[PDB]
Amino acid sequence: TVFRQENVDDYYDTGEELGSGQFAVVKKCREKSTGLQYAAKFIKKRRTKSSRRGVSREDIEREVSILKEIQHPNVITLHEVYENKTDVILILELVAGGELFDFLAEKSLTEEEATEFLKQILNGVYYLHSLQIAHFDLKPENIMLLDRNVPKPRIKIIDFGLAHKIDFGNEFKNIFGTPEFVAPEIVNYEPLGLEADMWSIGVITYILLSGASPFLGDTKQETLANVSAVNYEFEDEYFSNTSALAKDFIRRLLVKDPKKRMTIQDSLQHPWIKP
Numbered sequence: 124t125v126f127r128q129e130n131v132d133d134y135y136d137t138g139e140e141l142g143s144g145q146f147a148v149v150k151k152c153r154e155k156s157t158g159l160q161y162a163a164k165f166i167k168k169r170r171t172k173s174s175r176r177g178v179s180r181e182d183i184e185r186e187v188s189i190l191k192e193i194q195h196p197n198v199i200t201l202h203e204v205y206e207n208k209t210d211v212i213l214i215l216e217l218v219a220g221g222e223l224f225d226f227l228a229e230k231s232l233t234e235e236e237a238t239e240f241l242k243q244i245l246n247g248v249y250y251l252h253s254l255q256i257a258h259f260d261l262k263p264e265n266i267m268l269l270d271r272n273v274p275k276p277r278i279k280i281i282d283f284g285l286a287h288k289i290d291f292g293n294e295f296k297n298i299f300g301t302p303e304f305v306a307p308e309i310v311n312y313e314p315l316g317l318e319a320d321m322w323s324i325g326v327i328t329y330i331l332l333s334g335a336s337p338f339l340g341d342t343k344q345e346t347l348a349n350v351s352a353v354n355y356e357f358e359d360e361y362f363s364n365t366s367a368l369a370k371d372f373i374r375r376l377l378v379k380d381p382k383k384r385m386t387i388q389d390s391l392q393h394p395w396i397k398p
């Protein structure tokens with residue numbers, strides 16, 4: 124599939140850079156014809172087939188295809204796609220309140236504040252999983268706030284760079300995200316499904332409540348080893364006045380066997396969450 128090959132600068136003016144990762148750089152931008160603001164993500168293309176610099180066209184096309192499907196208040200939306208020899212440029216919805224990661228670093232939350240973020244994440248993931256989309260990279264830095272100067276910030280899930288449509292209950296691709304948040308099936312290179320996202324939600328919940336990362340070791344390999352062995356515990360110093368139902372929620376997500384792990388529907392019916 125090809126994208127718009129006119130110069131993006133003829134239609135948009137760029138401004139503040141919002142951040143960058145290994146292959147993408149994201150800049151605030153404004154569409155000239157409407158004055159409406161967006162986030163332009165510039166994704167570096169592979170220059171040769173055997174290269175490992177840049178993103179393969181197959182991976183870029185998968186991300187765009189998934190993004191085009193989604194319209195939900197808790198997930199980022201895609202406006203337009205441009206490309207040139209060097210980059211594919213995704214014109215995305217602007218979410219300007221910054222990362223949940225940075226929000227947590229400025230402030231530990233209450234269980235109310237924790238559940239208010241978590242419930243939105245769950246609703247967003249419920250939508251994705253209903254469409255058989257596994258995100259595969261759920262973590263606080265991939266959660267963006269619309270406005271962080273409000274008591275109960277609204278959030279949107281971003282970064283669909285590892286996302287896959289799961290048409291057969293599982294996928295068996297490369298797929299490996301951030302060690303602190305990946306499920307044991309990812310660590311062990313086993314077939315992956317929607318269950319992996321639910322493990323990541325358990326990790327996120329643990330962090331939301333405690334300010335600590337449950338499997339984090341001194342090196343990347345230690346963290347991965349901890350994940351595979353389900354080496355975590357609720358430290359009393361962090362959790363002594365956290366409700367037992369909150370711990371039960373996390374406990375039923377941080378389960379090695381994907382089949383025994385809570386699904387997104389289970390998580391919404393869990394007594395800690397259910398109205």
Ligand SMILES: O=c1c(O)c(-c2ccc(O)cc2)oc2cc(O)cc(O)c12
Binds near residue numbers: 142149199219
């Ligand atoms: O740093 C990043 C970032 O800020 C954003 C972003 C911010 C606001 C939006 O409205 C949309 C995206 O996306 C990203 C996507 C990546 O793959 C890697 C990144 O580093 C970012």
